[PDB]
A paper describes a structure:
Of note is the single salt bridge between Arg126 and Glu27 from opposing tight dimers, which may play a role in determining the twist between tight dimers. The crystal structure of the NmeDAH7PSR126S variant was determined by X-ray diffraction. This structure was refined to a resolution of 2.0 Å and crystallised in an orthorhombic space group (P212121). Like the wild-type enzyme, the NmeDAH7PSR126S tetramer has two distinct interfaces between the chains. Superposition of the NmeDAH7PSR126S homotetramer on the NmeDAH7PSWT protein yields an RMSD of 0.61 Å (1328 Cα atoms), whereas superposition of NmeDAH7PSR126S dimeric units on those of the wild-type protein gives RMSD values between 0.18–0.25 Å. These values are consistent with the small decrease in rotation of ~2°of the dimeric units with respect to each other at the tetramer interface, and this change may also account for the difference in space group between the NmeDAH7PSR126S and NmeDAH7PSWT structures. The structural asymmetry observed in the crystal structure of NmeDAH7PSR126S may contribute to the in-solution dimerisation of this variant. Similarly, CRYSOL was used to directly compare the collected data to the hypothetical scattering from the NmeDAH7PSR126S tetramer and dimer generated from the crystal structure. These data clearly show the NmeDAH7PSR126S variant adopts a dimeric structure in solution comparable to that of the NmeDAH7PSR126S tight-dimer. The dimeric NmeDAH7PS retained its catalytic and allosteric properties.
3-Deoxy-d-arabino-heptulosonate 7-phosphate synthase (DAH7PS) catalyses the first committed step of the shikimate pathway, which involves the aldol-like condensation of d-erythrose 4-phosphate (E4P) and phosphoenolpyruvate (PEP) to form 3-deoxy-d-arabino-heptulosonate 7-phosphate (DAH7P). Entry into the pathway is controlled by the allosteric regulation of DAH7PS by the pathway end products Phe, Tyr and Trp, or other intermediates of the pathway. The DAH7PS isolated from N. meningitidis (NmeDAH7PS), the causative agent of pyogenic meningitis and meningococcal septicaemia, belongs to the type Iα group. This protein adopts a homotetrameric assembly, and contains similar structural features to the other characterised type Iα DAH7PSs from Saccharomyces cerevisiae and Escherichia coli.
Numbering used by the authors:
A (entry chain B), C (entry chain D): 16 to 349
B (entry chain A): 15 to 350
D (entry chain C): 15 to 349
């Protein structure tokens, strides 16, 4: 029944020295990308949502080899998303409903999330997630190397407040109809200090005073129309410069950029590869929804197959990563 | 720097009176009736963009109470008592977050002052409305609120739909800042359902909460890239509302993007609404107006009764605007 | 550094159906002794203090064989004391300092105590302890079948309040100089309802309203002089009746009744044996300090040997239990 | 059924003033000076057995303040402001536990009232003392306390010795209800050391605390089966204290078992103490007296300024008793 406070989980599942070092390092490297110091491509890649730790670990084992192999061209970090914003109602992810049956066993959800994150980081795979809920971060944020604020929450002051106090770099998605300005505004908000109410590690509400997050950037995830091409990127960088914030940005191959057709993710990646070969100087990253098995399913019957947005399968993932590595290797050669 | 006192500290210093409790209960029911088309009085959510001075707020409430009473057969008047302001980037977030208006963020003081003003307003017979922006502050005052808003910038946010699903007052969801109505329709859907999520108890500890859903949600047309207040936008919205199986009674904001952020054009929007109410106006249950003692705005809190956030109409024009709506709705209610 | 609330421990170490039922039946069975509805003799027996779980489990397994053997004559419940009152300063028990080295790892101490109690009840051995601290009981009282309030705290209003809200029977010891009245007064006070501050399972202070504890009794543990003989028992019983409370009592064979000399416990047990054969109608229980190996030691060097008060070893334990079982079989047959 | 407000609720409504903090700091230091033989003024813990009416307590404090000033070179006068009462069995546990005196246990109001009264006392220039009975309540007002007692019924209790080890005021431990002095000497030992134990924070959450030990503890002679205030008893206690390596400055209660539970005998005891101070009295650092505006006791709070717990001397006898002790100690100090 009762909610265990973060300290209960931190006590049982303390961050290892390995996990700690991988997080600190990956955050700094990503920061270097955000601010143009390094020209590797951040690739945020993996399932739309985590519903099975076993499949997640297997996926991570395969992805780790590509992370190492392409480490001079790409900085691979896995999607380990525990919180899903629904259009109306639906399963909100492993934390809110881990047994996938409407039992809402949130204590078990948080434990499993933390434990998965700990295991990923211990094997050498850094993790990313969307920070949707205001209280759950205390349970796992120490294990996160990069955070997203979703299209649906980028304009929300309470999420900009949250981002302002997070220790990892944060990407803000443009709004669901394509509005980029709200994400530029969000970087501005989140880079400043805020005072607001939040929950401590002991589970009590408190006034927090944050320092601001210097490592925020935008993510182009499509709108009414896709926004991944060179023209959309150029216009975005112009707007970012006029706002006085970093003009290095991330492109989501999924969602409104593939128009909900997982087979178009490769096409968006190819367009990005062509940008990187021609110039692509404003691109610091890409996002990809990828799993062991392609497509999606309503019920969790098939192993390693998404129960939220459809993903590319492992084979296409190998091709997509090869494609970006080769292209960015050329960008970095200039 | 002081730790956060829990809701119980304030609830105990400032308990709700039987009178305030009765006003809130009754006003929420009356509003539910408007939202579901059972009564044809027009809800008018009117008053300052933000509260920054309780004294001016109380004087405003005294003048407004006279009109609330005068027009009570035509209009259901509820004061805007907004304590939480969503900024485009950065800026003063309202009385709770920064009550001394100087960047000292004395939230404990902000919370008691908000609760105390709300209790005084209800005790004088003036019900209160606010935008629920923050996730943890509502436990401190929600017992004193008769109608709530979820702002344009948060209607699409799952955590705000969650919050709404657990509120005991009717809730209006604004269309998005670029005009997207579908998100507010989706929000009614979400907020009408039960949710499980994390929240904070009255003792100040985090907990898992399980809400029952809010059956009294509606949309608010507040403009986008173009205004959306006219008969054609109302008609299109009503269609979409019916297609989604939710109430097709809606509220129209005369301010913000519908006035094009020009306080002098609220009356223009109100005239258009008045005309709709006289011709038909059957899908309109409410209106929103940004009004203060004195018109305009000011960067610093120098002038008494003048907004430090969005520019408002002043008292004289408020009288005219309200008389306009009362007269027009009298006609609508008289029609066979 | 931060104290985990009881709920953290109750979540990791939930009580089993078996342990739950054992605790429930044992409390019931013991209430029947307290109020004179059954004439079996409660025997609270085991180490002065628990300092090693392994030895506690070995002891328990031997004690279980005798609990079964003597179940028609004796109700055997193990001493599992985790909190020790010191005359001045010293080791306060396994909870306060579980590593025995002055590190005070109280979180570990509490989980270790809870886990031991869970294993004991799961093997069929009910447990008893002294409730000394106001905050720790919430972490394990669900696993306790009988509780003591010590000689040094029986007169304390806060301990009487505590006893008033526990769900197990509770014995109050006469005071360290031999005062019986403070224990009689304690039963009165603890049987009534109290309002006082206590800490919830979530770790927050609260006002609790107890219903009172109707299963309290006195324990004769000696004073300036021993108080175990039939003369002292008779005088205690008259005073008990005069206060309107149960005149069934428990006798400690240890502490000041043995003059702090562990061999003398058997002398006291023999004397009680004589009483149960003659009559002994006011006796409902005895307490005995017993370990695998006899004596004491300042350092935990020898396995199964006390580091607090000296205990009788297993050999003598067998003889003491045989003696009481045989004597009480005769009492019960009358 | 209200929930318990945490100490920060009351601290932010009733913050300690500069003047009150100053008086508390000074008084604790001054008493420490007595405990450790740097000053020879006599600490006098004097006032009602229990506080049950703030109006009467404030009137009493105003009278006592005049005397605190008059005798300040001889006596260090501190008011008894006892909020927590240990009962033999059942009964009214005090103003905190039951402030409306009717079994409604309105503990939030009780704590507020206690804190408010203590704040006003310190603000008028009168330092306050109390018995610390409960493990959770001290956080609400300990900052306003200049001297604390651990009662005879808890001096042997480990949880109370732990509490004492973390308090920032001097603490007196009473001998046992039957006359045992060893338990109080043992308690000073225990309380002088660092402890790790569970306690509650200002925010209302349980926590492990690590105390630094209380170097300012001393014993209180309060009688047992027989009274223990005379020179022979003082001398025997002093020897035992020196044998245990702890301060041999002690306090003598004129009330309770040393007066054989009879309020008219408190003067008898103070007379005896007065002669000890004139002859020698080098081990006596203080005394306790149960005093109110009007003498006696009463079961119902009918008469203003009259005890409803133990019987007290009235204001007239209080003036005489304090004159006595001041006169006698003036001579001790001059030797
Ligand atoms: Mn997705
Ligand atoms: Mn506004
Ligand atoms: Mn022992
Ligand atoms: Mn008294």
């Amino acid at each position: 029944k009762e909610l265990l406070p973060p300290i209960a989980h931190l006590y049982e599942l303390p961050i290892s020295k390995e996990a700690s070092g991988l997080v600190h390092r990956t955050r700094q490297e990503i920061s270097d990308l955000v601010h143009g110091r390094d020209k590797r491509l951040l690739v945020i890649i993996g399932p739309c949502s985590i519903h099975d730790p076993k499949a997640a670990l297997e996926y991570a084992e395969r992805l780790l080899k590509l992370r190492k192999q392409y480490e001079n061209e790409l900085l691979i970090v896995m999607r380990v998303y525990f919180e899903k914003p629904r259009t109306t109602v639906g399963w909100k992810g492993l934390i809110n409903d881990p047994h996938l049956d409407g039992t809402f066993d949130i204590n078990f959800g948080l434990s499993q999330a933390r434990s998965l994150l700990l295991s990923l980081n211990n094997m050498g795979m850094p993790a990313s997630t969307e920070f949707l809920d205001m209280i759950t971060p205390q349970y796992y944020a120490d294990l996160i190397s990069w955070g997203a604020i979703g299209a649906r929450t980028t304009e929300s002051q309470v999420h900009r407040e949250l981002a302002s106090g997070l220790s990892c770099p944060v990407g803000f998605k443009n709004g669901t109809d394509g509005n980029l300005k709200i994400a530029i505004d969000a970087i501005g908000a989140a880079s400043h200090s805020h005072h607001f109410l939040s929950v401590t590690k002991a589970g009590h509400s408190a006034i927090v005073h944050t320092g601001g997050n210097p490592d925020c950037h935008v993510i182009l995830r499509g709108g009414k129309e896709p926004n991944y091409d060179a023209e959309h990127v150029s216009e975005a960088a112009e707007q970012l410069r006029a706002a006085g914030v970093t003009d290095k940005l991330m492109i989501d191959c999924s969602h409104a950029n593939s128009r909900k057709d997982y087979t178009r993710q490769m096409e968006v990646a190819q367009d990005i590869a062509a940008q990187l070969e021609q110039d692509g100087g404003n691109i610091m990253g890409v996002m990809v929804e990828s799993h062991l098995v392609e497509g999606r399913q309503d019920k969790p019957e098939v192993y390693g197959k998404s129960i939220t947005d459809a993903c590319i399968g492992w084979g296409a993932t190998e091709e997509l990563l090869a494609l970006l590595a080769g292209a960015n290797k050329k960008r970095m050669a200039r």
